[PDB]
Amino acid sequence: NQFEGNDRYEGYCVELAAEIAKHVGYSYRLEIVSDGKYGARDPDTKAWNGMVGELVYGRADVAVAPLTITLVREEVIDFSKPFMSLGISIMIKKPQ
Amino acid sequence: KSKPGVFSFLDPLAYEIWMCIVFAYIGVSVVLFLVSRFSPY
Amino acid sequence: VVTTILESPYVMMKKNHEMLEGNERYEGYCVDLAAEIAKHCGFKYKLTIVGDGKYGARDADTKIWNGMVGELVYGKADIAIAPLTITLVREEVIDFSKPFMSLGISIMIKKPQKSKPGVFSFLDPLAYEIWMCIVFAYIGV
Amino acid sequence: STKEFFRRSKIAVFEKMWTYMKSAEPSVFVRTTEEGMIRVRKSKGKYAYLLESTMNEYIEQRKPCDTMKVGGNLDSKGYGIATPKGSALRGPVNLAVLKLSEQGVLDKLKSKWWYDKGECGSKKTSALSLSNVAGVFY
Amino acid sequence: GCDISPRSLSGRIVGGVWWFFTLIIISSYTANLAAFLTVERMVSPIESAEDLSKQTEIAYGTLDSGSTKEFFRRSKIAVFDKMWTYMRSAEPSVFVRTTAEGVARVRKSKGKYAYLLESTMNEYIEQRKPCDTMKVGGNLDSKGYGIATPKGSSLGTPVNLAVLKLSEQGVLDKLKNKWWYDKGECGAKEKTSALSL
Amino acid sequence: WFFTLIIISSYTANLAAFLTVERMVSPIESAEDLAKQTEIAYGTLEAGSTKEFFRRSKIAVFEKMWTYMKSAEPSVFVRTTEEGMIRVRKSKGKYA
Ligand SMILES: NS(=O)(=O)c1cccc2c1c([N+](=O)[O-])cc1[nH]c(=O)c(=O)[nH]c12
Ligand SMILES: NS(=O)(=O)c1cccc2c1c([N+](=O)[O-])cc1[nH]c(=O)c(=O)[nH]c12
Numbered sequence: 102n103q104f105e106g107n108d109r110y111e112g113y114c115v116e117l118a119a120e121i122a123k124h125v126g127y128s129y130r131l132e133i134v135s136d137g138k139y140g141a142r143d144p145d146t147k148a149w150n151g152m153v154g155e156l157v158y159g160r161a162d163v164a165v166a167p168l169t170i171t172l173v174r175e176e177v178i179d180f181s182k183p184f185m186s187l188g189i190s191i192m193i194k195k196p197q
Numbered sequence: 198k199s200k201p202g203v204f205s206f207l208d209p210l211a212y213e214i215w216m217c218i219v220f221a222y223i224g225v226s227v228v229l230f231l232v233s234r235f236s237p238y
Numbered sequence: 239v240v241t242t243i244l245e246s247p248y249v250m251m252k253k254n255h256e257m258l259e260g261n262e263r264y265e266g267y268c269v270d271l272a273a274e275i276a277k278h279c280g281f282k283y284k285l286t287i288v289g290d291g292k293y294g295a296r297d298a299d300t301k302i303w304n305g306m307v308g309e310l311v312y313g314k315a316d317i318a319i320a321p322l323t324i325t326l327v328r329e330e331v332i333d334f335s336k337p338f339m340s341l342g343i344s345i346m347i348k349k350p351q352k353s354k355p356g357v358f359s360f361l362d363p364l365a366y367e368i369w370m371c372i373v374f375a376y377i378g379v
Numbered sequence: 380s381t382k383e384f385f386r387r388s389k390i391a392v393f394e395k396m397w398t399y400m401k402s403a404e405p406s407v408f409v410r411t412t413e414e415g416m417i418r419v420r421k422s423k424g425k426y427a428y429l430l431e432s433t434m435n436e437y438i439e440q441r442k443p444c445d446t447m448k449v450g451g452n453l454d455s456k457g458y459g460i461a462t463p464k465g466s467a468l469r470g471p472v473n474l475a476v477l478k479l480s481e482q483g484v485l486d487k488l489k490s491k492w493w494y495d496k497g498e499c500g501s502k503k504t505s506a507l508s509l510s511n512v513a514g515v516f517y
Numbered sequence: 518g519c520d521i522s523p524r525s526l527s528g529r530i531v532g533g534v535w536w537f538f539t540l541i542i543i544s545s546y547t548a549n550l551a552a553f554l555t556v557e558r559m560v561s562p563i564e565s566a567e568d569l570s571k572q573t574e575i576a577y578g579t580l581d582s583g584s585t586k587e588f589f590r591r592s593k594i595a596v597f598d599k600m601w602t603y604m605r606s607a608e609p610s611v612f613v614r615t616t617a618e619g620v621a622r623v624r625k626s627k628g629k630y631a632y633l634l635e636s637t638m639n640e641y642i643e644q645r646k647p648c649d650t651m652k653v654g655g656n657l658d659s660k661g662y663g664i665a666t667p668k669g670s671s672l673g674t675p676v677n678l679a680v681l682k683l684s685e686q687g688v689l690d691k692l693k694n695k696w697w698y699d700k701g702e703c704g705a706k707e708k709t710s711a712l713s714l
Numbered sequence: 715w716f717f718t719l720i721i722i723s724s725y726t727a728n729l730a731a732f733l734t735v736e737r738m739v740s741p742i743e744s745a746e747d748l749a750k751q752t753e754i755a756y757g758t759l760e761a762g763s764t765k766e767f768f769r770r771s772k773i774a775v776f777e778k779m780w781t782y783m784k785s786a787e788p789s790v791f792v793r794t795t796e797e798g799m800i801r802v803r804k805s806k807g808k809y810a
Contacts, residue, residue: 113492120484121460124475125468156463163468164461167433169380170336172681179466180459181473182324184485186340186659188452189381190432192416194424195447209728210721213714218721247641247696267696274688275664278679279672310667317672318665321637323584326477328665333673337661338680338689340455341636343585345569345577345653346620346643348628350559355713360720363549364542365506371516372542379535389687390694391774455684457661480659483593490594502567505558507549515541543723551727555734699781704752709731712724 107131117184118165129163139166140174153178240283241306241318242268243292248321249285261285271338272319286315294328307332381429382408384454393453420445429453433493440497554709562628565654569631570599577631578604578611580619585633586612588658597657624649633657637697644701748810749775749782756810757783757790759798765791 107115110131122129140153148154152168155161157177169187170180207215242249248268255263264285276283294307303311306318310332324334361369385397400407409415415428416438435448460476462468479485494501509516523529563569569577577600579585589601604611611630613619619632620642639652664676683689742748748756756779758764768780783790792798802809 113488116488117479117485120479121472121475124478125471153461156461159463162462162466163472167458168461170457170459170681172678172685174461175336175677175681177464179462179464179469180336181461181469181476182329182334183337183340183457183459183659183661184476184480185433185458185489186337186342186661187456187458188432189384189429189454190435190448190452191450192419192428192430192435192438193447193449194419194422194426195445196424208711209725209732211711211713214712214721217714221717247700267692270692271689274683275676275679278682279675281672306665310665313667316667316670317676321662322665324477324661324663326474326481329474329477331668333666333668333670334663335666335673335677335680336684337457337663338684339637339693340457340659340661342656342658342660343588343633344636344639344656345563345566346623346632346634346639346650347561347563347653348623348626348630349649349651350561350628352557352559360724362506363546363553365504365508367509368507368512368542371509375516375538379531384687387686389691391777394774454690483588483591486658487593502565503560505549505553507545512541512545515538543719547723547727550723551730551734554728554731702786706753709728709735712728 114165114167121165132161139168140178142173149177239314239316240272240285241288241309241315241320242272242285243306243320244287245292245321249287268319268321275319281316283316288315294322296327303331416446436493440493440499442498444497444499554712557707561651561653563631563653566600566657567596569654570596570603574629575631576607576611576629577633578607578613578619579633580616581610581612581614620650635660640697644697644703646702648703742810745775745779749778752782754808754810755787755790757787757792757798759795760791760793 103109107130115131118129118131134152134155136151136154138151140149140151140156142149149157152161152164152166153174156164167185168174168180170183174180242264244250247266249264249266252258252263252265261284269285272283272285288306288309291305291308294303294305296303302308306315306320306322307328309315310318321339322328324337328334385393385400388394388397409418409428412430412434415430419426419428432448432452438446439448460472462472523532562572562575569575579589586604589597589604592598592601613622613632616634616638619634623630623632624647636652636656639650643651664680666673666676680689740747742751742754748754758768768776768783771777771780792801
């Protein structure tokens, strides 16, 4: 409540967006996907549910978040070269 | 059916170790004899 | 007019490649990849080689690209299918795909061997602190 | 995506995993990631979770720091920056991302928000230790 | 044995506890030695990169005039800054002129040289005869190998979608297994030996 | 006395090692045991139904065998069955 606008948000993606806009040279206003879910289409309704929707429907101009790169999205969206490579991994109890 | 050799009980230690064990036994015994029976005390 | 480079195990000449005529003598990873790419796109391809650097780069004076990048820029080939590294300078003059193989820097060492036994390796079963405590417990007793 | 990746896998090892998967755990599967983390923490090493490496590291650096990531990455994917089709922010954004990666910015941010803010730390001999035979000395 | 044993209760207490101590310690020594001789365990001195920076006995260098050296030079992480300092203040030249030169330098030496390279070639070599090398630790950088195309070719979107489809279904992983691990010489028990002098 | 202690303890320990290892030894009893290990080479007739059966196999274990098969034995394969029997007899357990 103390801070308003982008100043209230802190994290990796925020600083990444700062640097990206600095290099491109544009001002940005953050927000959050109300659905709170990453993009995905309804199999029957054929409608996207998430930030992909906020992009392809003109609501948003860019998405800066952990968007997994997939074929379904790459057809209706223009991604960028991965800023973070990633993979499936194994999590175990730390041996005391 | 591998027939275990007689003197396979020596296999845990190499031949050289047994040889030098014998040598050290002789040396120890001689040095003990000497350092015990030299000084006319 | 695809392109490739002999760096193994991406492109290599199959055993007895004299018998093979063309596009079948080559073997490796990049070749199977190009096969599947052509299958999913349809076009027909003839694997080739370039040399003259074996990869992309630029001469600051000549300002002429060399290798796969050089030939793609100048029309000598259609696409390059090879372990070609994604980089800023190249993306400014060509267009890449999403990485088909991600990697990074790593450390190579010689495999640890059975170390030659050290003099006083007969103390190894117990830590040095145990041995010193043994000595001083002997003294104290 | 992990369940689909295992189900639709043509590899031997992950095929065996899937054959094991869907067994009578009763439920090896889970509905929420926090649920999986809690289940692994409660289990005395009897459960292993499969998840994205980034979250595994973040959790490993979270209090109480009672879990760890082990092994390499089974799959290989990436996170990207999205723009709508036919936008003017395509080339510049990709160029910026690549320039940042070469400059080392992204790795520094990774280290900062994963390790320089972790509750836990940063990072052998089979010889018998004095703790094994302490009662003798006492 | 003993040519004398204590007769008083206090001396006998001392002797008894000493006897217990001796029994336990000798048993422990013999048992742990049996463990050592039964199970061979070779520990790699290095399991990360910080371990490599702290160590000075082991030397490490990249290929001279390459992208890896350019990475270490312009670095901002502390560990890689330390490595760059070392490599710039190293005698003789840790650097190398060719990949095979680095591989040979690693193989000829015995745990003295560690070579910093790409993960893929390292994994390949760890499967070559002689199988006298291994890769340690994680990866210090992120990179990718990408299919290229001239600016304006109609082949961009199709190849992007093709690689994405192949990755999703799992073709590329299978090909890597085929050309790195399979088609690989050494894959992934020896009777116990008598003790030597 | 110190020398004696060390030597007797070493003898007992190495004898225990010998017997323990001799007790671990699980011989080959199935296709899997042969498949995973590689200290022993296995090959069938060059031309025959066995080579075709392994080549055209959709099973995991025999797929692994075939992957191993056609390797640099130099020649795990053989031309005559008597040749295979003689080769196994000559090999000191190094061929199956
Ligand atoms: N676009 S995405 O691909 O939707 C996706 C994007 C970003 C993070 C994800 C994620 C998914 N997922 O698959 O559902 C699962 C998941 N699970 C975790 O535990 C975590 O930390 N992050 C994630
Ligand atoms: N585009 S590239 O960047 O040209 C390049 C592409 C592909 C493989 C490379 C490589 C370079 N390099 O840096 O020069 C060095 C190098 N060194 C090795 O030891 C190895 O196995 N593979 C490589």
